[PDB]
Structure formats: structure tokens, C-alpha cells
Amino acid sequence: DRELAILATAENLLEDRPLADISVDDLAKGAGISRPTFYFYFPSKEAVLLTLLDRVVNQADMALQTLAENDRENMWRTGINVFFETFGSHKAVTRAGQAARATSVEVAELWSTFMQKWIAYTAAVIDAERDRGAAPRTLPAHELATALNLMNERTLFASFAGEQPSVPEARVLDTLVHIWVTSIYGE
Amino acid sequence: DRELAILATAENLLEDRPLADISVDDLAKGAGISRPTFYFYFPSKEAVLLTLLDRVVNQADMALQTLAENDRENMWRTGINVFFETFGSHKAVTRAGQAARATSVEVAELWSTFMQKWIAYTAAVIDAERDRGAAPRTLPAHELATALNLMNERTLFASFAGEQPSVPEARVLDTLVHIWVTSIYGE
Ligand SMILES: CNCc1ccc(N2CCCCC2)cc1
Ligand SMILES: CNCc1ccc(N2CCCCC2)cc1
Ligand SMILES: CNCc1ccc(N2CCCCC2)cc1
Numbered sequence A, B: 001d002r003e004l005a006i007l008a009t010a011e012n013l014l015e016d017r018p019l020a021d022i023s024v025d026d027l028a029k030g031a032g033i034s035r036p037t038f039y040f041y042f043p044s045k046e047a048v049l050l051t052l053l054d055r056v057v058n059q060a061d062m063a064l065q066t067l068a069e070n071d072r073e074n075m076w077r078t079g080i081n082v083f084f085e086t087f088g089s090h091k092a093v094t095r096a097g098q099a100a101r102a103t104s105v106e107v108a109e110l111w112s113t114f115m116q117k118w119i120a121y122t123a124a125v126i127d128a129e130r131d132r133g134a135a136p137r138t139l140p141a142h143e144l145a146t147a148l149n150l151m152n153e154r155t156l157f158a159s160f161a162g163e164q165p166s167v168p169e170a171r172v173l174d175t176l177v178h179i180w181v182t183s184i185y186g187e
């Protein structure tokens, strides 16, 4: 399938260079198609990135939904790990998709919708923990959930991209889980 | 002074539109100078932004240094508030400077150097709290400090920019302080 070959080529090329340094000819060439055939499937390379990002985000969303449908520290660690493993398996798409937020309304909306959904879920679990007496009623659950999920987005991204500063990738899950558990269950 | 007029004009224009939508003629016109006179002071509008960002970051750094040279929850709240009030007083420069990270090595290095400095300081205070028995020895202090400061960067930025999702600006200091205090002092 030619559309899949375009997507595979784009992800492969994003490992080596940013989207600005990839041409439609590069994408068409790697996919084994002509430039006009490429434009049948996508109007631009930015549309290719949007489709790649949608597939990665959808993969994380489906894994989280699978977890949601089935100790306290391990509960949170298993969910945070979905983000760690899913986006960490597509670091080039993740990095390019984060950068495209500044210039693409569709990319920004894709990220925003996903984040709002799992912030709302986080808040609902915190509320449930408070209802059963396991967690104290401290901050508004939705505000706490927002900050913790923004921390995870920024901190996981830093670890993936090798940024300075960053938590080493091999330490970042423990670091985030500690902060989540102490801030959710601590007085 | 013509350089200051350029900087003032750029900050004023960044409140209304991004840097891509501001021309050197716009900057020169607002500053009351010609285009070639502008290029005496700055080689590009991106250099103007870099200078603006350097002034804002330096303002925060000097305020933090003043605090460092002079209860536990209030100690952390007063320091986090430096970031809240300094960058919140220059939201347009802050937003443009964050966006320029993706394309400017000098902007990225400016942010990185500042962040590394106050992560190192945060870690040193955490270590001091552990040395005097006030905080438990849980995560490596530098890793904990890294995640907490990345949370603050991402979460304050979201609140300033009106992003969705975000913590409301009037709630964001309480939210961050809670997470810092529980994760630093909690077992
Ligand atoms: C039964 N709840 C399973 C579960 C499902 C999802 C999560 N996460 C926690 C990390 C943020 C997304 C939601 C945590 C636990
Ligand atoms: C509620 N949203 C939680 C969330 C947490 C982390 C992320 N990211 C996405 C960017 C790469 C790091 C993981 C995205 C969403
Ligand atoms: C005596 N220590 C004062 C003090 C100075 C700086 C801070 N911050 C805390 C927020 C991150 C930057 C460092 C906290 C407390």
C-alpha cells in the first residue's frame, strides 16, 4: 500500500533530520512513487506528520483505554508507563509532532484533545481514591491532574530528546511515579 | 536610545502577533528609525527576540539570586513565585522565546543554561533539607529537582498562554507548591 509506504518513509526520515529538511521528493522517492502520486494521498508533508502523530496518539489512547477497562503505586506506574513506552517507541514522530504544535492548529488540537481526555480520567481516579478514603482532599483533583500530566508530557519529552536538562530515560518513570504518588496521597 | 526603542517596539508587537508576522520594517517604524539603522543594532528580528528573552531571564535569575542570598512551604512558594511573576510580566516575550527554542540554538542554550542553574540550586536545597533531617531521602535530589522544575516550566507556560489544558493562572502557584512540598517532604 502506497499510503503506508509514505508514512513509513516519513517516520524513517524523521529519525535523521527534522521535517524542514525533508522534501516531498524525499518522501515520494522512499515510498517508490512519483510526486503527483504522493499528492493524491497527502496535500503536504505536514499532513503526513499529522497522520503519523494521530497513529501514535491513538496507540497510546487505546492502550490506556485497555488498562482503564480492567497496590496504588503500581496502579499509577502502569498507566504512566503507557506514555513512556508508546511515545518512546516513536521518538522521532513525537519530537516532530511536538515541534509542529507551534505552527499547526490541527496538531495542537490533536495533542490538546488527547491530554484533556486523560487529565479528566486522572482526576476521576483521584476523586475515586478520595471517595474511598485512600487519598486526602487537598488540591482540586482536576487542577492536580492537569499539573501532573503536564509534568509527564514535558519530562518524558525531555528524556526522549536527550535535552539538557532532563531526567535520564532509565530513571524517568521512577521519578514521575514518586511525584504522582506523594502529591496524590500526601497531606 | 534607539536600541531600547527597538526592544520596546518588539515586545509591544509580540503581544498582538507572532514573530513571523512582524517585519524589520515594523520594528524600525515603531522605533522611529530606518531599516539600515535597525541593522546596525541587530542582524535580524530573531536577534531582537534573543535580546528580549535574555533580559527577562536575567531578571528572574537576579531575583532568585537575591532570595538565595538572604516555614518550609513558604520558602518554596516564594521562589516559585519569582518565575510566576517575572515571566508572567512578560508573557509575549516568554511565549515567543519558548517557540523560538525549536529553531534557534542560541535561544535553546539560553533556556538550558538558566534551567540547569536553578535545578542545581533546587537540588542543593533539597540535599540541605535532607542533611538536617527535615526531608526524607527518597529520589536522587537532582532527578527530583529536574522533574519539578520541568513541571513548573510547562505548567506556568500553559497558564500564561491560556492553553487547553491548563491550570487557571489564579490557581497555578498553589498547585505547583502542593506538588513540590509533598514530593520533597513526603515518604
Ligand atoms: C484502573 N485504572 C487503571 C489506570 C488507567 C490509566 C492510568 N493513567 C495514569 C497516567 C495518566 C493517564 C491515566 C492509571 C491507571
Ligand atoms: C493527560 N495527558 C497526559 C500526557 C502525558 C505525556 C504525554 N507525552 C507526549 C509527548 C512525549 C512524552 C509523553 C502526553 C500526554
Ligand atoms: C533560602 N532559599 C531561598 C530560595 C531560593 C530559590 C528557590 N527556588 C525554588 C523554585 C526553583 C528555583 C529555586 C527557593 C528558595
Ligand SMILES: CNCc1ccc(N2CCCCC2)cc1
Pocket (backbone or CB within 6 Å): B083, B084, B087, B094, B114, B115, B116, B117, B118, B119, B149, B150, B152, B153, B154, B156, B157
Ligand atoms: C530550574 N528552571 C526552573 C524554571 C521554571 C519555570 C520556567 N518558566 C519559563 C517559561 C514560562 C514559565 C516559567 C523556567 C525555568
